[PDB]
Amino acid sequence: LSDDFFRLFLDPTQTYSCAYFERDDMTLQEAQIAKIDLALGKLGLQPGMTLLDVGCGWGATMMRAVEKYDVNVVGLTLSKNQANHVQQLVANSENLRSKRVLLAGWEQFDEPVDRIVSIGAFEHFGHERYDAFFSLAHRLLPADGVMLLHTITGLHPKEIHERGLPMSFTFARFLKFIVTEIFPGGRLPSIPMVQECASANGFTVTRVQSLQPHYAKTLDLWSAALQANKGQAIALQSEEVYERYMKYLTGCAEMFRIGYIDVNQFTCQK
Structure with a gap:
């Protein structure tokens, strides 16, 4: 899937x-800025x-930080x-603030940093090295270093509650199946898991902000936009991919509408 497809x-x-x-x-753009x-x-x-x-992505975050917080x-x-x-x-930056981009993974970065931010990308699920991650976050942040992790999370077995759906281990397991195999189709960390992995590497989760409502609308805006460009989409990829996304975007939006899927920003103050 070309980057051109997503740009649609x-x-x-x-x-x-x-x-x-x-x-x-x-x-959508103002919301992404906010x-x-x-x-x-x-x-x-x-x-x-x-x-x-x-996971700087196309760089919007970096530039925004330099602009509103004047930092390297x-x-x-x-x-x-x-x-x-x-x-x-970034080329020819006169700005009296260093701006550097690296084509490496977080597991290969080894530099003294003052603050860390990590905003995940949708379909990129693979939260199975969170423990080592905080160890690195700790091993790089100042004594009062702070890190923010924006990630999609799934419901911990003992975390659900008060939604109006079955509370059995059989229903939970089924939903866990749907979530890991279809929507979104990957293994998600639970809020407890992050709070625990953090509380065991030198961190303290100060806040956990949910943006669940927002994702329903984000996904709603992505699907509408995609449909409006069905032509180009089918032209860049195919009618099979187009349909796959329309229904994957639709399906994922629903998973949030029931709460088995969540998206949280974890202020990890150490």
């Missing part, structure tokens, strides 16, 4: 994650500090195209 429905910043409609009247600000506004960034963006910034991505893109954007 994502906003100009190409943010493939939950948007934050701080205002109901916000556009989401980024929501994240950043939680790190207590001070001019001169160095921010690490784990290091971004990591496993996407040649995203690195290329941000690297070009």
Whole structure:
């Protein structure tokens, strides 16, 4: 799936994650900005500090940090195209603030940093190395370092409650199946798991903000946008991919509408 395909429905910043409609009247793009600000506004960034963006994407977050918090910034991505893109954007920076993009994984970064931010990308599920991750977050942040993790989470067996659906172990397991195999179709971390993995590597989860409502609308806006470009979509990929996404976007939006799927920002203050 070409990056061109996703550009058919994502906003100009190409943010493939939950948007934050701080205002109901916000556009997908404004919501993505607010989401980024929501994240950043939680790190207590001070001019001169160095921010690490784990999974910088097309760079919207980095640039926003430099702009509103006047800080140096290091971004990591496993996407040649995203690195290329941000690297070009960063070229000839007169700004008295360092801006660096790296085509490496977080497990290969080893630099003193003041604050860490990690906003995941939708279909990128693989939260099975969270323990080692905090160890690294700890091993890089200042004594009062702070990190924000924006991730999709799933319901912990003993975490559900008060939704109006069966409370059995059989129903939970079925939903767990649906969630891991179809919508979204990957293994998701539970809120307890993150709070626990963090509380065991030198961190303390100060806040857990849910953006569940917002994702329903984000996905709603992505599907509408995609449908409006059905022609181009079928032309870049095929009618099979187009349909797959329309129903995968639709299905995932519903999983949030029942709560077995959630998206949280975890302020991890150490």
